[PDB]
């Protein structure tokens, strides 16, 4: 997150860190949202390959023992069948990870609440992106979970030529684009939490930014619209 502030430890208990085996250790590579004690929702491009993954829930500082983490392996990955690695702009950037064991819920570990299917937020709706992604374009990962206020940019505006044009689809949510705050590498797969009827719910799965940089004025961070996949999500969980 560029332009973020450190989140309090218990503000975003559904946020997870998806890590892959690197050398003799584990390396954070993407964010995710715990949606069942044994299922994590993330971006398909994060799990599109042949890497070995573990999920860390209750994580705050990637480089220090928080005394709250649970580590768990990923037993099965279900990527959206329509996901095309060669065209992230086509959409379907979402995958579900079935965890080897159910994690235990507590103030650091909770299920992310999902919006009702079909929900599209009014322009400028209040949301927050969270993650350990880069703190500057071409910079380094944050050590502690960061958050940044990123109001939505509705489809009509997001799809206009000075913004994302044809690149954005209605199956996505655009948020931010203020030139200062944005998602950045390592935030992919993470939640966009939006306040609706007094409850924060996860309306987006972090997907992409401008080739020009993370915080680029009028190139809001783009997310997969969670509300477009509620039936898909429920069908996967019901069958695995």
């Amino acid at each position: 997150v560029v332009g973020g502030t450190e989140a309090q430890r218990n503000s975003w208990p559904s946020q997870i860190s998806l890590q892959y085996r690197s050398g003799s250790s584990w390396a954070h590579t993407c964010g995710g949202t715990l949606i069942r004690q044994n299922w994590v929702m993330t971006a398909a491009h994060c799990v599109d390959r042949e890497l070995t993954f573990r999920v860390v829930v209750g994580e705050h500082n990637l480089n220090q023992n928080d005394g709250t983490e649970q580590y768990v392996g990923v037993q099965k990955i279900v990527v959206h069948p329509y996901w095309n690695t060669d065209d992230v702009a086509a959409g379907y950037d979402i995958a579900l990870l079935r965890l080897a064991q159910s994690v235990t819920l507590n103030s650091y570990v909770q299920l992310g609440v999902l919006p009702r299917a079909g929900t599209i937020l009014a322009n400028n709706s209040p949301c927050y992106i969270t993650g350990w992604g880069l703190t500057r374009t071409n910079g380094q990962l944050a050590q502690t979970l960061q958050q940044a206020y990123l109001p939505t940019v509705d489809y009509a505006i997001c799809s206009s030529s000075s913004y994302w044009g044809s690149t954005v689809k209605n199956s996505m949510v655009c948020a931010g684009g203020d030139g200062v705050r944005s998602g950045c590498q390592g935030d992919s797969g993470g939640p966009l939490h939006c306040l609706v009827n007094g409850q924060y719910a996860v309306h987006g799965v972090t997907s992409f930014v401008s080739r020009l940089g993370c915080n680029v004025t009028r190139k809001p961070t783009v997310f997969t619209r969670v509300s477009a996949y509620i039936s898909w999500i429920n069908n996967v969980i019901a069958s695995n």
Binding site: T29, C30, A43, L51, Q185, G186, S188
Partner: peptide, 11 residues
């Protein structure tokens, strides 16, 4: 550009 670390094409 997708937001996987180090990159989409390079973990």
């Amino acid at each position: 550009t997708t937001l996987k670390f180090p990159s989409d094409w390079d973990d």
